[PDB]
Amino acid sequence: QPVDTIIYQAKVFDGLGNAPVHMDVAIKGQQIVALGELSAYQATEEVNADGLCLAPGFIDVHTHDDLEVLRNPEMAAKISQGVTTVITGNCGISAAPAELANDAPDPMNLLGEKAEFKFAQLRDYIDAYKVQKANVNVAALVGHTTLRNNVMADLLRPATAAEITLMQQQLDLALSQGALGLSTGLAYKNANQAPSSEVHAFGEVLKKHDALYTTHLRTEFDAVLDAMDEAFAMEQAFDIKVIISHLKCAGKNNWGRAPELLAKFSEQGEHSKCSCDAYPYAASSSTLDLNQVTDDFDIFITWSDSHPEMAEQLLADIAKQWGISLLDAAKQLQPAGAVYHGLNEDDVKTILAFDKTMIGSAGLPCDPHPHPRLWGSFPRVLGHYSREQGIFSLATAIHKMTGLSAANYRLANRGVIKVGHFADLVLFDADEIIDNATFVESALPASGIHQVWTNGQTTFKDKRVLPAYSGQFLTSLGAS
């Protein structure tokens, strides 16, 4: 008869892109149990949401939070944005299944330090998550580069057919233990010599488990359209779900080409199910890479192990202080992290507006001065691009971080405000929600989020991140 909580009089967005409905929402246990006008229900707690909006909890489909959720189960960077679920294991790197010999090969340092990789099997990682759980749900992909490192000591080559056989078996076991699918990061030096046929060797395993394929493209610069062909070939050959990560046309050469990327989806063939995600910024962030050094746009160093006095400075200013070229300064700064202001804002708007595009933060949790997407992506979409810029409605914006993402990743009973679905929810003020993180002050929490529930338990309330630790590990459904 009774319920734990009723949220009264909010503008409720279902997560499916439909117009909001003014109504009340009842939570009991982990579940949404009633929707409508509910003053006839007995609730332990009552939340007055008059003038506020209620949406499904946001799903961050592009994270490198594999080890961050173990180090930092409160997950304030995500929870303070309204994110209740993270997809881990992106761009070819995952915490599991991974056995390291001497070091963690690049880019696995984006996840954590080599000693943190303690999960020879995915089941080991799930056990570790279940020790404390976390404020976010976790669903995990397996990284192709991580699989390569398990069986190859020299990564600067194709894997042998025998090494491919081992990787197929390791993925098959990870999928059976609960992984969602496989990710690749083919632009990175330690995967770039994998030919398309090496990636294709995983297709039968993925198809057998009805699993996902996600990809950081082999290049996102001049030849990005060719790189997209590679991703479509997985869909064509195996009829599996493919997601292109952080879609962009990078480089001054390619500013204005976003329509070409949208039109490229017409080349998929018989199946038309490829999706993509993007973060809402015109600046990327990664290790300082000599191939990306240019004078075409600002490049900011975020950290440098060689010259920590140069952290948070513009590469052009560093070069001038040092009396050498941008490229020579970059060589001396390595290893380092950078933010590259190399995207065009109109391209970003077009990619965000594309109806296939989900919102993903691509936040780098080990960065000591992170790109502000780590703390602002989702309220930036709702407050900057929807309310202020008007490029889409609030219903559309919410859909692209909730119901669209749960559907594309097959997240059962999430992403939608519907009776019987999990009570992952965000209460916010539609007129005040906004990102506050800037490139200079990159960890400022967003405004406008009043309360967050993860599986029916409050993980954020009135600026407090709360250790409910009610997240669950979301094991894959496998085949029929």
Ligand SMILES: [Zn+2]
């Ligand atoms: Zn990536």
